Amino acid sequence: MKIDAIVGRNSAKDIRTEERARVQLGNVVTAAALHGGIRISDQTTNSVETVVGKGESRVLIGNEYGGKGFWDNHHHHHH
């Protein structure tokens, strides 16, 4: 009885944030996720050693669910 099969695991060893920085640890679920399907056969272990943030740095430990933009905004022209 030491360890068994586990799915999804967000752990951090060290997180440094300064200069009006924000840090959040956990699973993010957008409104879109509501009414649909979460369990999509996942089992990845997320583990970070040391995270250094400078000039308004953002720290996110865990998985994110949503279609409206991947976390933040981003757009441009293609070819």
Next chain:
Amino acid sequence: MKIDAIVGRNSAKDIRTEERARVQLGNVVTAAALHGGIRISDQTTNSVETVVGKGESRVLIGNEYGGKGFWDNHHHHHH
């Protein structure tokens, strides 16, 4: 002690914040993500070792639900 498999669990080993910093431990529910329903899934375990915040740093331990701007966004510029 403490036995479980595939179950959310927000835990913090140590959190240091200074300079008008804020820290909150728990789940954050947004208006977009319906009202306070509680209990949605909780499978990934969130655990942070040491969190350092400088210059009005924000500390958030746990999962967040909401589609209206991740945490607190309001961008507009397009590149």
Next chain:
Amino acid sequence: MKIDAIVGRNSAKDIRTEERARVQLGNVVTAAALHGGIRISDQTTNSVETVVGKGESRVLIGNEYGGKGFWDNHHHHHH
């Protein structure tokens, strides 16, 4: 470290982010992402040693699921 699994797992040794940079570690699931029952088996493992981010750098540790592009709608397009 703090893990027994030996297959499929996103881990980072060091991550540096500055200049309004953001770092997210975990599996990304788009709104469309729904298909996917329940199962268990091997998987691709990802491990990064040291990451250096400058000028609004973006750090993503893990797999991403979604049709719309791959992560950032910039280049490439439909046929």
Next chain:
Amino acid sequence: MKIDAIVGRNSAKDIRTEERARVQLGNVVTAAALHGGIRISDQTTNSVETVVGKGESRVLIGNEYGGKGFWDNHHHHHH
């Protein structure tokens, strides 16, 4: 506690990204990817020594499954 194990498939010794650059490590699964062998499992082991990115550099470490031509490329063959 135990720090003795293999490296994995996708591994990066060092990755440098600057100028609104982004780095994503993991398997990319498109929406098209449905029930039919989605679990590519372990096959090819990719490992990079030192990576340098300048001017909106893009870093992708891992395999891409799904129907969309390709992750990121200029275009088809020319004359």
Next chain:
Amino acid sequence: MKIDAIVGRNSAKDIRTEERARVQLGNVVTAAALHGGIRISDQTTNSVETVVGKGESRVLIGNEYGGKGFWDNHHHHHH
């Protein structure tokens, strides 16, 4: 940095990318997926020393499977 062990597969010693350049390392699998072949084990070994990319450079380390002509080849049919 501290590693030493003979290993084939896709490996890179150094990769330089700048000027809106993109670098990707891994096996590309189209939606079609590898028909049959219950056994999917690596065979061919590829190793690059140093790659210098200038003015929108593209780096691809690994095998590619899918339609199109450039950056991917396929069988298809003819008339």
